[model samples]
Target: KETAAAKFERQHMDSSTSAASSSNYCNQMMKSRNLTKDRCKPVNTFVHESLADVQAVCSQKNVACKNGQTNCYQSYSTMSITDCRETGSSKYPNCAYKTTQANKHIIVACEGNPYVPVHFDASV
Candidate 1:
């Protein structure tokens, strides 16, 4: 079984893709990455940063989680990321997405023995 950190890396990390040049980027990646298991993922983010940099975010800055959880941290620097949002007219299975790229600080919920980010709360 993949660990939470590995899952995060698989689902969100994409240092190779610097930007979302294609409209189908999220659509293709979401399905191909197995994130569309039972249904389409309405929203997701792909970070175009190194694994070490992302992992280090856990100790970057203290902050509250989006929903008021305590174990959250906000990144000190803006990250290159692609935010994928489902189109209003899109349906499940044939999940369509709107890929928008931006440089923003990422906020995530950290956890586990090694103390790393597990839940991607939001990006701002």
Candidate 2:
């Protein structure tokens, strides 16, 4: 029998095409922020299942990474990190952060009708 994680991973993988498209939407949103050009930084998404499931979906989608690398899993519980530099200063003077840490419920996608969790956090 497949373990729960395994089953979740399988289901999650099946959604890769859609997931990848969603991830792209997220990437565009991040780029619009104009913080930095680094595309590897994590952009959090609220979805059903455990953090493991999120990682599984990322793995299936092959999210971008630094230095031409790709990562399926992210290290931080929060989503993305940003830093801003002061005028005429080389260092970042301000910083902002976002996350999906508060997402606590799971909503499975059924055959006829499906609803995915939304990002409830203000920063998302």
Candidate 3:
């Protein structure tokens, strides 16, 4: 199994060759800002789940109801997990989330990279 850090690197690194450079960037940023481990820790944002890991449980949730009835039976529960790291600069770093819902989507923002929206399906 891939570790969280490894997964993050794999998913976010611009290219395999950039891993070393990214690590160097992180180190320099931390040192310049005198940031402690806690300050540099990752941030998580979940769509359906709370920040504390208490699942955002749902039951018989409904969106659009039957044609004119406005009352239909629909149930769905969603949960997401994400790990974010601070970039070298003072600006906010990028954040990401992974989920189990089919046809799920995400928007990612990074310092240099353009905002990217990704779609996630049931397939791995």
Candidate 4:
């Protein structure tokens, strides 16, 4: 469904922007992106590459998702990414996060006929 793909894009893709040592980035982004409306997301990642670049991962090496799904694939090249991990003292409405950036091979699950990333599995 397009909703799934749209959710994936909202939660993962950050094509032309990124955080720079600012702890507020995640807080602002999480709320602005509508991820903090209910409960705080414990962890989330933002890919800094282009949408096409990430879509190509659907055709890369096959892998197993953490849930044991076989629809996952890993990227052929390392990609720039930012991971937002929730802070311990934070509560639901007041979600806080720690931003960490890296370059790694990302793994994602693909679906739909066009083969786009529907889930961000991991990065290594």
Candidate 5:
């Protein structure tokens, strides 16, 4: 079975691709990553940093998560990322997305023995 941390990486991590490289980036990514299978992921964010850097965020000070989870940590460094917002006309199989590039400190919820990020909380 795929772990939540692994699933998170598959759904959110994109270290190699340049942020906002193309308008069709999310369109391709969402489909390729299997996020557009059943229904389009309404909104998603992709971090453009190495997995090691992102995983290190678990050592940061604790913060409140969107769902009030206390296991969240905010990154000390601003990271490059792209937010994918499902377009107004986006349909199930043809999910379209609008990409927005940005630099922000990310917040994530961690878990397990090594304490890796399992959920993306927010970006500030």
Candidate 6:
């Protein structure tokens, strides 16, 4: 079985991919990663930073989550990430996503000793 941490990495981590490879990246990855099998993920993000750097965000100051949860933390520096937003016309089994990359401080929900990211809350 896959660990929660590992699953999150497979779904959202993409440090090895070229920074701005191509517009088709999300289509390929979302499908290849098996995220598009059931349904298209509406809005997803892929962090292009090192694993250690992403984990370190948990050490940053806590912030309020979208639903008012207080466990989320925001990164101190702008990190490279890609935002994959599903196009309106996209349909399952043929999902389409617009790929965009930017630098921003990411917000993530974290927990446990040696705190680690569990949810990708948003980016600022």
Task: Give all candidate RMSDs, comma-separated.
Answer: 1.2, 15.6, 15.7, 1.5, 0.8, 1.3
User: How many clashes would you count in candidate 1?
Assistant: 0
Query: Residue 55: error of model 6 in Å?
Result: 0.6
**Can you rank all candidates by lDDT, best first?**
5, 4, 1, 6, 2, 3
Q: How many collisions between residues are there in candidate 6?
A: 0
Per-candidate TM vs. native? 0.93, 0.19, 0.18, 0.93, 0.97, 0.93
Residue 94 lDDT in candidate 3 = 29
lDDT of 6 by residue, 12-53 (tens): 788796465899888888888888889887888999999898
Model-by-model lDDT, in order? 0.87, 0.30, 0.28, 0.89, 0.92, 0.86
Top candidate, metric lDDT: 5
Worst 10 residues of 4 by lDDT: 16-25
Measured on C-alpha atoms, candidate 3 has an lDDT of 0.28
Q: List where candidate 3 sits over 4 angstroms from the true fold.
A: 1-38, 47-77, 80-83, 90-124
Better of 2 and 5 by TM-score: 5
* Clash pairs for candidate 2: none
**Which 10-residue window of candidate 1 scores lowest in summed lDDT?**
108-117
Estimate candidate 1's alpha-carbon lDDT, on a 0 to 1 scale.
0.87
How would you encode candidate 5's per-residue C-alpha lDDT over 1-124 as one tens digit per residue?
A: 9999999999999988758788888898888989999999999899999999999999986898999989999999999998899999999888999988899999999999899999998989
Give lDDT tens digits, candidate 4, residues 1-124. 5488899999989886743356676777777888889999999898989999999999999999999999999999999898889988879889888888889999999999898999999999
Model 5, which residues run further than 4 Å from truth?
none
Model 3 earns a TM-score of 0.18
Q: Candidate 5, 15: how far from true, in Å?
A: 1.1
Off by over 4 Å in 1: none
Candidate number that wins on TM-score, 1 or 3 = 1
Clashing pairs in 5: none
What lDDT is reached at residue 25 by model 2? Answer: 38
Lowest lDDT 10-mer window, candidate 6?
Answer: 11-20
Off by over 4 Å in 2: 1-49, 72-124
